[PDB]
């Protein structure tokens, strides 16, 4: 959040392509994730603190 | 002036971690070749009969002089492409084992 | 082909293509160099050697109807006789080879 670097992305399948962070005012940021997997079995999306 | 492919303690092609066959240069190739020649025995080389070591005729069979075995082994050590001459040969014959020791001379 | 040997300085004469040839091969610093003479008359001096390109460069000399010479790879006097050869080609095949070059 504070520095603005995409730290870790993981490949279990052929899914991910790119990920990026963009600066916004007042401690706000936007996260983008691009996934291009051969299959189509999207089931759920999880978000949690680390 | 010689070269060959490396083999392990058993006489099979040995590959490195990278999976590439290695072509040994001289000296070491001479050692490998002389070991293989001494291990060959006569009677089975098609296209060249009467080459090898006469184990079953000159060593294992009961014999009179044992000079013939020395001659045959000396010939087998020779005929290598690089070997020039033999420095020593022992032929121990102690207990049950048939000791053999040799020191070979090469151009390089 | 042209018989050779592994010697830093040599020169041979041979009769091919209905003409008399004499070639001198020697090492100069790093690259190899050659001198070519035909019928007792000098032709070229100090031409470098490379794989595939012809020895005779300027248009007039190489042939109205004669041949030319080409090394398969870069020259080295220590590898002569073993994997490095020199070949002679008369007019027809040299012409088709030159056409194939472009």
């Amino acid at each position: 959040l504070d520095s603005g670097n995409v730290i870790s992305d993981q490949m279990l399948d052929s899914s991910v392509v790119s990920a990026r962070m963009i600066r916004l005012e007042n401690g706000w940021w936007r996260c983008v994730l691009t996934t291009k997997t051969v299959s189509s079995s999207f089931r759920a999306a999880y978000v949690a603190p680390a | 002036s010689t070269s060959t492919i490396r083999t392990g303690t058993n006489n099979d092609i040995l590959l490195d971690d990278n999976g590439n066959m290695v072509i040994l240069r001289d000296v070491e190739a001479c050692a490998q070749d002389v070991r293989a020649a001494m291990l060959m025995r006569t009677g089975e080389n098609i296209f060249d009969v009467n080459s090898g070591v006469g184990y079953f005729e000159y060593i294992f069979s009961p014999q009179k002089s044992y000079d013939d075995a020395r001659k045959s082994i000396a010939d087998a050590i020779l005929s290598s492409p690089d070997v020039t001459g033999i420095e020593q040969l022992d032929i121990d014959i102690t207990g049950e084992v048939f000791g053999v020791d040799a020191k070979v001379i090469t151009i390089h | 082909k042209i018989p050779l040997t592994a010697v830093p300085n040599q020169a041979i004469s041979f009769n091919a293509g209905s003409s008399y040839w004499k070639i001198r091969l020697y090492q100069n610093m790093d690259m190899m160099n050659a001198d070519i003479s035909r019928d007792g008359v000098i032709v070229c001096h100090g031409v470098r050697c490379f794989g595939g390109i012809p020895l005779l460069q300027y248009s007039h000399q190489y042939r109205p109807d004669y041949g030319n010479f080409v090394f398969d790879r870069d020259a080295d006097w220590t590898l002569f006789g073993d994997g490095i050869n020199l070949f002679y080609l008369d007019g027809a095949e040299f012409a088709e080879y030159q056409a194939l070059a472009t």
């Binding site: - | 006489n11 070491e28 050692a31 002389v34 291990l39 070979v104 | -």
Partner: protein, 504 residues
């Protein structure tokens, strides 16, 4: 379909293989590396083994790589090297017991009831440890560390664990420093780690916590463990003057057993020479401040280790040997004269502007007036002493009794004869040298017999054996002892050439 090796077996092996039995003259390095246990010495036969055990980044690998690649005039190589540890500071007790590649992650299924027994000051046991996961050996090491920390013993309350990879050992470390003893024992529990782990099984190295010690004590203990070496050395950081002086004195206490080689700079020679006047067996070498060390101090050790003593024509000179890898230190006559007066060794350059010539020049060695100064004489005396001692012990161990009569002394001569023959064929003895008047007087003074100087001029040696009686200090009783005296003409090597020619 049954195998060749049951009937015919050929070992082959590359040339230059010389089987040898007897005293070995090889380098010994005292290091402060943590990996080496204090009480064990290790011998290697190749640079690759050292690389595998220590790793490329280590100084020791560089030293060994420089040491092994060396050829004498007669083609020879050191073919061996030894290592030992010197503890610089107080250390905690520790254990280590693995050498073989047991670790292939077999901890799976071993979680239930881990009951490794740790025999500390008071007997204590460990509780069940989960190893069914067996994700990684560092993970299970941390797990074992945490379970040990769960104990309340002062030593195990802050213990640590470590696993090395290129070599395969598991290590424990105590909490306090300088005191304490640990031990480990197996139990009757079928699924115990100690049997699978390195420790508590057969050859396991154990360490007792103990304070810091002087280097001389460390080398003395190392010798007490084993003494099959010559020309030991300290690696790592340079030592101060006082420690070097102490080590030199301790080495001089032994009579011609090893060579002490050290490295020093030009500005430092003025101090050391005054301190270490006499004290034979110590070599001084000049080191360059500007460039890398290049390990100049190893040169005499390599030269000595390359020497073969059984074959004839063995004695070699130290004045002219070329080391392409090393650098150059001195290039002027004035500095060379000062260094020679200071009894130093160096690699001097004779020229630039063309192919260079440099060589390890001075074969001299600091010592008192009585003792030999040249290096080759020192090495020859070392070998001679070893051979004589071995022959005498063989005599004592073989014959049933040695009477104190003429027969006994005849037996002693008979036994010593082959060693003297080997020596005179080797080159440590010399014949035909001229004897000065003062030398003749000295010889006659040492041995009561006159005309022995003629013997040492012709053959090169003179021996005599007599027996007497004495009483030992330990017990009031008396025994019989034999005394011999040996005088021989020292070997020499060419250093300087004189010439002259006249037209008629």
């Amino acid at each position: 379909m049954i195998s060749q090796s049951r009937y015919i077996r050929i070992i082959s092996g590359v040339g230059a293989a010389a089987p040898v039995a007897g005293r070995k003259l090889i380098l010994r390095v005292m290091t402060t590396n943590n990996v080496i246990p204090p009480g064990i010495v290790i011998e290697f036969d190749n640079a690759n083994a050292v690389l595998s055990y220590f790793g490329a980044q280590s100084e020791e690998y560089q030293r060994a790589a420089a040491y092994f690649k060396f050829i004498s005039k007669s083609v020879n190589s050191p073919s061996s090297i030894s290592f030992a540890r010197w503890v610089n500071t107080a250390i905690a007790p520790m254990v280590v017991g693995d050498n073989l590649p047991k670790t292939i992650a077999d901890f799976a299924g071993f979680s239930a009831g881990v009951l490794t027994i740790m025999v500390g000051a008071a007997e204590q046991n460990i509780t069940a440890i989960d190893t069914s996961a067996a994700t990684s050996m560092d993970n299970v090491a941390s797990i074992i560390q945490t379970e040990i920390r769960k104990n309340a013993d002062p030593q195990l309350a802050q213990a640590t664990v470590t696993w090395n990879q290129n070599t395969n050992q598991f290590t424990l470390v105590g909490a306090t420093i300088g005191t304490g003893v640990l031990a480990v024992a197996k139990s009757a529990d079928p699924q115990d780690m100690s049997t699978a782990l390195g420790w508590s099984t057969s050859n396991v190295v154990n360490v007792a916590g103990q304070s810091a010690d002087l280097p001389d004590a460390a080398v003395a203990k190392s010798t007490n463990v084993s003494n099959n070496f010559g020309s030991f050395l300290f690696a790592g950081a340079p030592l101060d003057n006082d420690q070097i002086k102490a080590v030199s004195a301790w080495n001089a206490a032994q009579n011609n057993q090893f060579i002490y080689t050290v490295a020093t700079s030009l500005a430092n020679l003025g101090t050391l020479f005054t301190l270490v006047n006499g004290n034979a067996g110590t070599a001084l070498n000049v080191l360059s401040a500007t460039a890398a060390n290049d390990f100049v101090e190893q040169c005499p050790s390599e030269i000595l280790a390359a020497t073969n003593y059984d074959e004839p024509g063995a004695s070699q000179n130290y004045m002219y040997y070329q080391f392409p890898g090393r650098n150059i230190t001195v290039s002027d006559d004035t500095v060379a004269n000062t260094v020679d007066k200071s009894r130093g060794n160096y690699i001097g350059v004779t020229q630039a502007n063309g192919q260079q010539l440099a060589f390890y020049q001075r074969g001299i060695l600091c010592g008192g007036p009585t003792d030999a100064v040249d290096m080759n004489v020192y090495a020859n005396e070392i070998w001679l002493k070893s051979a004589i001692a071995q022959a005498l012990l063989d005599l004592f161990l073989n014959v049933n009794a040695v009477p104190a009569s003429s027969t006994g002394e005849a037996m002693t001569l008979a036994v010593l004869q082959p060693v003297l023959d080997k020596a005179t064929a080797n080159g440590t003895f010399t014949y035909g040298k001229e004897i000065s008047a003062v030398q003749q007087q000295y010889i006659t003074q040492v041995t009561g017999d006159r005309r022995a100087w003629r013997q040492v001029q012709t053959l090169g040696y003179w021996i005599n054996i007599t027996f007497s009686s004495y009483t030992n200090s330990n017990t009031g009783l008396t025994e019989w002892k034999a005394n011999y005296t040996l005088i021989y003409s020292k070997g020499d090597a060419i250093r300087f050439v004189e010439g002259s020619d006249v037209m008629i």
